[PDB]
Design an enzyme around this catalytic site. Structure first.
Site, PDB file in Angstrom:
ATOM      1  N   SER A  45       0.824  -1.203   0.000  1.00 54.13           N
ATOM      2  CA  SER A  45       0.000   0.000   0.000  1.00 54.13           C
ATOM      3  C   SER A  45       0.861   1.259   0.000  1.00 54.13           C
ATOM      4  O   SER A  45       0.348   2.372  -0.108  1.00 54.13           O
ATOM      5  CB  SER A  45      -0.938   0.005   1.209  1.00 54.13           C
ATOM      6  OG  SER A  45      -2.157  -0.651   0.910  1.00 54.13           O
ATOM      7  N   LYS A  48       0.742   4.049  -2.749  1.00 54.57           N
ATOM      8  CA  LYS A  48      -0.337   5.047  -2.839  1.00 54.57           C
ATOM      9  C   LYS A  48       0.193   6.486  -2.650  1.00 54.57           C
ATOM     10  O   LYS A  48      -0.332   7.446  -3.224  1.00 54.57           O
ATOM     11  CB  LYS A  48      -1.438   4.721  -1.845  1.00 54.57           C
ATOM     12  CG  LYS A  48      -2.222   3.465  -2.188  1.00 54.57           C
ATOM     13  CD  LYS A  48      -2.844   2.783  -0.964  1.00 54.57           C
ATOM     14  CE  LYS A  48      -3.995   1.890  -1.435  1.00 54.57           C
ATOM     15  NZ  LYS A  48      -4.284   0.734  -0.534  1.00 54.57           N
ATOM     16  N   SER A 105      -5.822   4.061   3.483  1.00 56.64           N
ATOM     17  CA  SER A 105      -5.386   2.961   2.633  1.00 56.64           C
ATOM     18  C   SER A 105      -6.534   2.395   1.800  1.00 56.64           C
ATOM     19  O   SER A 105      -6.489   1.249   1.400  1.00 56.64           O
ATOM     20  CB  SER A 105      -4.684   1.863   3.461  1.00 56.64           C
ATOM     21  OG  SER A 105      -3.725   1.152   2.705  1.00 56.64           O
ATOM     22  N   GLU A 141      -5.376  -2.875  -7.248  1.00 56.79           N
ATOM     23  CA  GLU A 141      -5.835  -3.378  -5.964  1.00 56.79           C
ATOM     24  C   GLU A 141      -6.987  -4.368  -6.210  1.00 56.79           C
ATOM     25  O   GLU A 141      -7.847  -4.104  -7.037  1.00 56.79           O
ATOM     26  CB  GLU A 141      -6.317  -2.224  -5.080  1.00 56.79           C
ATOM     27  CG  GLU A 141      -5.220  -1.282  -4.579  1.00 56.79           C
ATOM     28  CD  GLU A 141      -4.306  -1.940  -3.572  1.00 56.79           C
ATOM     29  OE1 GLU A 141      -4.458  -3.162  -3.356  1.00 56.79           O
ATOM     30  OE2 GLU A 141      -3.453  -1.242  -2.974  1.00 56.79           O
ATOM     31  N   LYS A 209       3.297   5.911   5.486  1.00 54.49           N
ATOM     32  CA  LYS A 209       2.373   5.028   4.798  1.00 54.49           C
ATOM     33  C   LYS A 209       2.904   3.604   4.903  1.00 54.49           C
ATOM     34  O   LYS A 209       4.049   3.297   4.553  1.00 54.49           O
ATOM     35  CB  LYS A 209       2.157   5.422   3.336  1.00 54.49           C
ATOM     36  CG  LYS A 209       1.068   4.602   2.591  1.00 54.49           C
ATOM     37  CD  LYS A 209      -0.340   4.858   3.157  1.00 54.49           C
ATOM     38  CE  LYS A 209      -1.323   3.854   2.655  1.00 54.49           C
ATOM     39  NZ  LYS A 209      -1.317   2.635   3.490  1.00 54.49           N
ATOM     40  N   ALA A 212       0.648  -3.991   3.772  1.00 54.90           N
ATOM     41  CA  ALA A 212       0.741  -5.401   4.059  1.00 54.90           C
ATOM     42  C   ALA A 212       0.313  -6.134   2.804  1.00 54.90           C
ATOM     43  O   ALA A 212      -0.418  -5.591   1.973  1.00 54.90           O
ATOM     44  CB  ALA A 212      -0.164  -5.778   5.244  1.00 54.90           C
TER      45      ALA A 212
END
EC number: 3.5.2.6
Length: 263
Positions: A45, A48, A105, A141, A209, A212
């Site tokens: 993540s 991002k 997230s 994603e 940030k 996982a």
């Protein structure tokens, strides 16, 4: 400090998995410490931050606006969309989507933002143009979190991520306004509780940030420092471990505690 590298290797050995670490002077770009900093890891993540960097870059160039509203449907929703699932009727602005993506997230938010710049390949193209020919995103994603051994897709190295991030927060990359926004978004991170934040002394600045993924994948990117000002960038990634999430968090938090202790 060498003692941090000892703890990094400790985390590697205990986790039974590659750990990747770099510490970068925010001011000079000078590499302070490193361990596997040129090996590829899943970005998770953490990408991002780069995504919204690209977006703020389109805003600077007048090809996007922070306040532009975007509408979408239920069918666009993927796993873990706490913010975006709450706005199917009213839509969200590019600002609200970057806030969702960074501070929460939010996955669907990341996907909606990605569609604006031409997908994963468009973020990759952006990154190329800003001088990062290492970091790549290839999938959307949630699939980008898969972490298949030997798969270069959706990866970066600690050095690339750290230097690209440093370029976005302090470089010629973004307008000062856009820098401050990206920073402010990272400062407002709500979902990195267990990591660097857990060991950060009162008065210290942090803008971060975390991510996982599958196969024990875990990472964090951060601008941090004492006395209310960031002076450093730290990047930590790990992939492959079969330890618990609690153990993964804990190992990263201990690395943080060492870097703080030997600052």
């Amino acid at each position: 400090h060498p003692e941090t590298l000892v703890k990094v290797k400790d985390a590697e050995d205990q986790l039974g998995a590659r750990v990747g670490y770099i510490e970068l002077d925010l001011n000079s770009g000078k590499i302070l410490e490193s361990f596997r900093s040129e090996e590829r890891f899943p970005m998770m993540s953490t990408f991002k931050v780069l995504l919204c960097g690209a977006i703020l870059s389109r805003i600077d160039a007048g090809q996007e606006q922070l306040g532009r509203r975007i509408h979408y449907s239920q069918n666009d929703l993927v796993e873990y969309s706490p913010v975006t699932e709450k706005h199917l009727t009213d839509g969200m602005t590019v600002r609200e989507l970057c806030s969702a993506a960074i501070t929460m997230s939010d996955n669907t938010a990341a996907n909606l933002l990605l569609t604006t710049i031409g997908g994963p390949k468009g973020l990759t193209a952006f990154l190329h143009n800003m001088g990062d020919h290492v970091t790549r995103l290839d999938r959307w994603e949630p699939e980008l979190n898969e972490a298949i051994p030997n798969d270069e897709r959706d990866t970066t190295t600690p050095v690339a991520m750290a230097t690209t991030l440093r370029k976005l927060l302090t470089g010629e990359l973004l307008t000062p306004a856009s820098r401050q926004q990206l920073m402010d978004w990272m400062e407002a991170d709500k979902v990195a509780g267990p990591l660097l934040r857990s060991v950060l002394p009162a008065g210290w600045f942090i803008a971060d940030k975390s991510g996982a993924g599958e196969r024990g994948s875990r990472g964090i990117v951060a601008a941090l420092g004492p006395d209310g000002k960031p002076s450093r960038i730290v990047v930590i990634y790990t992939t492959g471990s079969q330890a618990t999430m609690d153990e993964l968090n804990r190992q990263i938090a201990e690395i943080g505690a060492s870097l703080i202790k030997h600052w």
